[PDB]
From a paper:
CCs are quaternary structures comprising two or more α-helices supercoiled around each other with cyclic (Cn) or dihedral (Dn) symmetry. Here, we describe variants with all combinations of the aliphatic residues, Ile, Leu and Val, at a and d to give four classes of peptide: the ββ class, with a and d = Ile or Val; Lβ, a = Leu and d = Ile or Val; βL, a = Ile or Val and d = Leu; and LL, a = d = Leu. Peptides are named systematically appending the one-letter code for the amino acids at the a and d sites to “CC-Type2-“; e.g., CC-Hept becomes CC-Type2-LI. In summary, solution-phase data and X-ray crystal structures demonstrate conclusively that different classes of Type-2 coiled-coil (CC) peptides—i.e., based on abcdefg repeats with predominantly hydrophobic residues at a, d, e and g—adopt a range of distinct states.
By contrast, those of the βL class and peptide CC-Type2-LL showed weak or non-specific binding of DPH. And LL sequences form collapsed structures. Surprisingly, the X-ray crystal structure of CC-Type2-LL-L17E overlaid almost perfectly with that for the parent CC-Type2-LL; i.e., all six Glu-17 side chains are completely buried within the core of the assembly. However, the cognate structure for each sequence did not always have the lowest score, as apparent from the off-diagonal white and blue points. This occurs for all of the LL-based sequences and those βL sequences observed to form collapsed structures. For these, we propose that the collapsed states are adopted as they lead to more hydrophobic burial and contacts.
Author numbering:
A (entry chain C), D (entry chain C): 1 to 29
B (entry chain B), C (entry chain A), E (entry chain B), F (entry chain A): 1 to 30
The structure:
Amino acid sequence: GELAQALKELAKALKELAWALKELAQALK
Amino acid sequence: GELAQALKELAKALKELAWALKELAQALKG
Amino acid sequence: GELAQALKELAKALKELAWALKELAQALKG
Amino acid sequence: GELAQALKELAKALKELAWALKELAQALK
Amino acid sequence: GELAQALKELAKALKELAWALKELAQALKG
Amino acid sequence: GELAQALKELAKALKELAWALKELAQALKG
């Protein structure tokens, strides 16, 4: 219910955080 | 539940971490 | 309940980190 | 059982992470 | 359980984040 | 199980962030 929806919301953020990390990795070379 | 409520505040905080890192990334690229 | 308040707390921790990294980011772009 | 022990292990790390954050805050002033 | 196993790998990662931030803190203080 | 692999994944995310911040830290101390 309300928790399966909260869980994909965490899934989205987790992807978002990865993308930012690749951007910062890129920025450090 | 209140667990779900928790996961919701964590997803919100991850998102702001993600934004901050992109901000930091750009700060360094320029 | 066992776990909810531990994940809520990790959310505040990351939120603080995000603010921390915006300040760092600001310091570096000047 | 094994999960109540894992949970205080997360509790410890959470404290540890806070302490590092105050150190970095300190470092930025 | 496998949930507990998860919380264990998260506590381990928080600890290394904590170390990295202190490393970053010192990098800036000097 | 629902949640385990999401928290395991957040652990890898933070581990990567910690490595990211060690590199940043190294870049700044020279």
